[PDB]
Scaffold this active site. Structure first.
Site, PDB file in Angstrom:
ATOM      1  N   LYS D 154     -15.746   2.548   6.655  1.00 41.35           N
ATOM      2  CA  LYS D 154     -14.788   1.590   7.555  1.00 41.35           C
ATOM      3  C   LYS D 154     -13.670   2.550   8.240  1.00 41.35           C
ATOM      4  O   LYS D 154     -13.330   2.431   9.497  1.00 41.35           O
ATOM      5  CB  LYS D 154     -14.084   0.579   6.840  1.00 41.35           C
ATOM      6  CG  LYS D 154     -15.028  -0.444   6.261  1.00 41.35           C
ATOM      7  CD  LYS D 154     -14.468  -1.337   5.511  1.00 41.35           C
ATOM      8  CE  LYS D 154     -13.505  -0.754   4.339  1.00 41.35           C
ATOM      9  NZ  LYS D 154     -14.615   0.072   3.552  1.00 41.35           N
ATOM     10  N   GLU D 180      -3.641   0.465   1.758  1.00 44.37           N
ATOM     11  CA  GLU D 180      -4.796   1.473   1.586  1.00 44.37           C
ATOM     12  C   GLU D 180      -4.124   2.795   1.028  1.00 44.37           C
ATOM     13  O   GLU D 180      -3.127   2.611   0.353  1.00 44.37           O
ATOM     14  CB  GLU D 180      -5.380   1.768   2.964  1.00 44.37           C
ATOM     15  CG  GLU D 180      -6.183   0.494   3.277  1.00 44.37           C
ATOM     16  CD  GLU D 180      -7.412   0.554   2.413  1.00 44.37           C
ATOM     17  OE1 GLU D 180      -7.838   1.725   2.002  1.00 44.37           O
ATOM     18  OE2 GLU D 180      -7.837  -0.546   1.852  1.00 44.37           O
ATOM     19  N   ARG D 181      -4.681   3.678   0.966  1.00 45.00           N
ATOM     20  CA  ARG D 181      -4.399   5.050   0.521  1.00 45.00           C
ATOM     21  C   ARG D 181      -3.331   5.557   1.105  1.00 45.00           C
ATOM     22  O   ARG D 181      -3.227   5.913   2.236  1.00 45.00           O
ATOM     23  CB  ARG D 181      -5.519   5.855   0.335  1.00 45.00           C
ATOM     24  CG  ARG D 181      -6.705   5.292  -0.577  1.00 45.00           C
ATOM     25  CD  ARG D 181      -8.056   6.350  -0.505  1.00 45.00           C
ATOM     26  NE  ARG D 181      -8.995   5.881  -1.154  1.00 45.00           N
ATOM     27  CZ  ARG D 181      -9.873   5.303  -1.014  1.00 45.00           C
ATOM     28  NH1 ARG D 181     -10.072   4.771   0.488  1.00 45.00           N
ATOM     29  NH2 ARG D 181     -10.958   4.896  -1.683  1.00 45.00           N
TER      30      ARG D 181
END
Ligand SMILES: Nc1ncnc2c1ncn2[C@@H]1O[C@H](COP(=O)(O)OP(=O)(O)OP(=O)(O)O)[C@@H](O)[C@H]1O
Ligand SMILES: [Mg+2]
Lengths: 83, 115, 173, 458
Positions: D154, D180-181
């Site tokens: 993604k 997210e990261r």
């Protein structure tokens, strides 16, 4: 007649010695499966270490309106209501 | 002296109320007269208000509300050692063979910590 | 909120007070019981999980103005179900049921300025025929309605304020 | 004025005097040790109790703390002062640079544009990517969703779309990191500063370390910046790093908010919470938003409520398959599940439309044969069925492509492929012009000419 009964109540509770627990102190209300419910601890904070009898701790997970919910960092089975 | 009284009986689950300063600790053993036999209860939970909640180690039928309950202060304790060899027992360590009493030298509690 | 659980206790107490023809006293007793319920030390005791009988007899201790034969019993019945915090609501329903039993209504009137006695006469005399009860008016005239009057009884409301007409007209937009 | 009366995880109950109770979505403020904590009001309970979500860590909160009532919602900086900067959910600066030179702040809770305001557009937007604009092309001002499981691609796909679209496009852009990261936030920021494109991009980050209130409302902080640039009359690109985290942070708080569980334990409000977020991401007669969203699919279950609700919201949908990615075909787009509103003869025209439907028909028929092949083997097929397989396998390889951002993995250099070259290549394969080449000739080649040069050396 309201303020004088309100202060008569303050006199009577003193006569019968009914009084709060100290802040930072409380009593175990219930014990099951390592979850502990405590009444009192009006100054406990979320995620605090609560020292139990013996030499062990519970971690405060919930500050409910009337109690603290906590989990025991060790064997729980010797704990009892009213410690 | 018995100090508790039975306050609910819902199948195998028996609730007992004790005085506030005497509430048994978890995993302890209670006993009650179920008519003409003693019935053991194992404590599972301490509820609020001196009520404790227990599992019957036997048939629950014939229990009334308000029966007296003796708080044995230890867990279930069972006979151990050489005297047990060649004997059949139930979970309570009572002989299920007909072969008389077990000549126990000790009884140990069944709930203990690992090495 | 304790309003539903107060209902059974409120009715019992009133019927008993009727059969014993002592309604005024009880209302005094329930008021006292509702004030000890508010005391800051007792409010901790009531929240902690004492056994019902150790809590009740400690509650009975702090009231000596209670009819013990009938009034300690009430307290003991509520304690056995943990209900004592409902006492301030049990009081309000006892007062409510009493006023229905005495077929009497409180009515609140609000206006831009104080009314005349002749207006208060016509208001009360109308409302008694509206309600088929006796009425007792109170007037709580207000800073924000600039003309007219509001009448509230129970939760039925009649509005003749100009404030209400200005908005009720603007609604036709 | 207020008092804290309960603390349950992320949720804090506050009591107020009954004449003063805060409105829904008001911000509150409380001193927590040596820092200031904001709370957002969710519900009015009875008796002046109000129930709120902490925009920060709730540990160390006591009962009985005094709480201050701010008279307004959470409001964030907007406009050009936000460009080139990294911001908190609360709109605080998160780069080490000075304060943000705001001229205006906007509340993050807003109504969607009215039905009269919306605008249609059919301008096809080109991408570098063979499968995407062949199978699921998309327009300027439309919404794209990248659906996939864990680790399927993604983010690499969205990084090619940023590279291809957001550097040939000239206007401003917003990137919202949602759950997210943190490493990938830092990596992205440095490549923007190294390329000196940072000064066109606003970055809002509420990454997965953050407590649930941050992850839930950072999406709305991101949109509120993009809505300022749209209402100014610009054309804007909005990138959302994982929309699924918005819903999941709702699930985490919903039980503590006292709401009965629904379905697979989701909040009962799931479709409204998603819908009110999604409807704001629309192009309008005043100005346009083009949007790309990544959509994590839990346990690869495309029938889970959260993916399922998201599918109705979007104009183009690209579905990434673990089963393809484990072949090592990348991008792992499933062409039998990916689809677009724009794949229509009127807008694309017939040659594109016929090529896409041909590819879809051959690849469908290859799925119908695979259960025969799996037991009996291929020799039992008919000689036409063998030709469908021999073509379909080439088509699956030619859908693969080298990405410029993927060079750190593949090593081989990235390719940009025109729409004219993609339809010409697949139309040539289906006509059978290339049935003399091996399958390996098609794997990871930019254009059909590159396949024939690869075939010479096999
Ligand atoms: N086009 C590609 N070429 C080479 N490798 C790729 C490509 N697309 C994805 N991969 C590989 O897939 C792995 C994960 O992809 P990516 O990081 O984009 O997934 P992701 O979106 O972060 O998934 P999640 O968000 O669930 O972790 C990476 O190792 C990447 O090398
Ligand atoms: Mg990712």
């Amino acid at each position: 007649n309201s303020t004088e009964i309100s202060e008569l109540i303050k006199q009577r509770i003193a006569q019968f010695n009914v009084v709060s627990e100290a802040h930072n102190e409380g009593t175990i209300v219930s014990v099951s499966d390592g979850v502990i419910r405590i009444h009192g601890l009006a100054d406990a904070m979320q995620g605090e270490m609560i020292s139990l009898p013996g030499n062990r701790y519970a971690i405060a997970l919930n500050l409910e309106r009337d109690s603290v919910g906590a989990v025991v960092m060790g064997p729980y089975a010797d704990l009892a209501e009213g410690m | 002296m018995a100090t508790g009284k039975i306050v609910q009986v819902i199948g195998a689950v028996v609730d007992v109320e004790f005085p506030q300063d005497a509430v048994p600790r978890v995993y302890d053993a209670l006993e009650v007269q179920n008519g003409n036999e003693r019935l053991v209860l194992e404590v599972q939970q301490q509820l609020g208000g001196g009520i404790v909640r227990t599992i019957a180690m036997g048939s629950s039928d014939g229990l009334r509300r308000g029966l007296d309950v003796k708080d044995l202060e230890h867990p279930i304790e069972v006979p151990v050692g050489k005297a047990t060899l060649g004997r059949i027992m139930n979970v309570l360590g009572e002989p299920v063979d007909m072969k008389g009493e077990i000549g126990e030298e000790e009884r140990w509690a069944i709930h203990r910590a690992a090495p | 909120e304790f309003i539903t659980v107060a209902r059974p206790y409120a009715k019992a107490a009133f019927d008993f007070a009727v059969e014993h023809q002592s309604v005024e006293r009880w209302q005094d007793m329930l008021a006292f019981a509702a004030e000890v319920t508010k005391n800051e030390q007792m409010a901790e005791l009531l929240s902690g999980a004492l056994a019902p009988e150790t809590l009740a007899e400690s509650f009975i201790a702090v009231a000596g103005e209670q009819l013990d034969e009938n009034g300690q019993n009430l307290i003991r019945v509520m304690a056995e179900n943990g209900r004592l915090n409902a006492l301030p609501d049990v009081l309000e329903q006892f007062i409510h049921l009493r006023a229905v039993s005495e077929a009497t209504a409180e009515v609140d009137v609000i206006s831009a300025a104080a009314l005349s006695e002749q207006q208060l006469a016509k208001i009360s005399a109308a409302m008694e025929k509206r309600l088929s009860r006796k009425v007792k008016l109170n007037a709580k005239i207000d800073k924000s309605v600039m003309a007219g009057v509001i009448i509230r009884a129970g939760d039925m409301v009649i509005d003749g304020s100009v404030r209400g007409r200005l908005e009720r007209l603007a609604d036709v937009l | 004025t207020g008092k804290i009366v309960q603390v349950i995880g992320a949720v804090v109950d506050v009591e107020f005097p009954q004449d003063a109770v805060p409105r829904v979505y008001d911000a509150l403020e409380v001193q927590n040790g040596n820092e200031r904590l904001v709370l957002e009001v969710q519900q009015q309970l009875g008796g002046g109790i109000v129930r709120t979500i902490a925009m920060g860590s709730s540990d160390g909160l006591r009962r009985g703390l005094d709480v201050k009532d701010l008279e307004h919602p959470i409001e964030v900086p907007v406009g050009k002062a936000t460009l080139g900067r990294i911001m908190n959910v609360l709109g605080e600066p998160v780069d080490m640079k000075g304060e943000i030179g705001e001229e205006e702040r906007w509340a993050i809770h807003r109504a969607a544009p009215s039905y009269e305001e919306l605008s249609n557009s059919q301008e096809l937007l080109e991408t570098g990517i063979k499968v995407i604009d062949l199978m699921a092309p998309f327009a300027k001002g439309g919404k794209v969703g990248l659906f996939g499981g864990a680790g399927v691609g993604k983010t690499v796909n969205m990084m090619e779309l940023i590279r291809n679209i957001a550097i040939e496009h000239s206007g401003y852009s917003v990137f919202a990191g949602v759950g997210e990261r943190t490493r990938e936030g830092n990596d992205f920021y440095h490549e923007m500063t190294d390329s000196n494109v940072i000064d066109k991009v606003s970055l809002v980050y509420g990454q997965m370390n953050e407590p649930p209130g941050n992850r839930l409302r950072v999406a709305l902080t991101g949109l509120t910046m993009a809505e300022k640039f749209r209402d100014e009359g610009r054309d804007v690109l909005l990138f959302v790093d994982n929309i699924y985290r918005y819903t999941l942070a709702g699930t985490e708080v919903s039980a503590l908010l006292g709401r009965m569980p629904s379905a697979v334990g989701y909040q009962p409000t799931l479709a409204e919470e998603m819908g009110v977020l999604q409807e704001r991401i629309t192009s309008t007669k005043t100005g346009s938003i083009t949007s790309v969203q990544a959509v994590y699919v839990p346990a690869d279950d495309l029938t889970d409520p959260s993916p399922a609700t998201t599918f109705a919201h979007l104009d183009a949908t690209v579905v990434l398959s673990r089963q393809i990615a484990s072949l090592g075909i990348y991008p792992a787009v499933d062409p039998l599940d990916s689809t677009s509103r724009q794949l229509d003869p009127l807008v694309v025209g017939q040659e594109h439309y016929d090529t896409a439907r041909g590819v879809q028909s051959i690849l469908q028929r290859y799925q119908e044969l695979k259960d025969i092949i799996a037991i009996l083997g291929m020799d039992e097929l008919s000689e036409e069925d063998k030709l469908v397989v021999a073509r379909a396998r080439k088509i699956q390889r030619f859908l693969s492509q080298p990405f410029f951002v993927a060079e750190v993995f593949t090593g081989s250099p990235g390719k940009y492929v025109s729409l004219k070259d993609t339809i010409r290549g697949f139309k040539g394969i289906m006509e059978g012009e290339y049935d003399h080449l091996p399958e390996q000739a098609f794997y990871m080649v930019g254009s059909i000419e590159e396949a024939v040069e690869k075939a010479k050396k096999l």
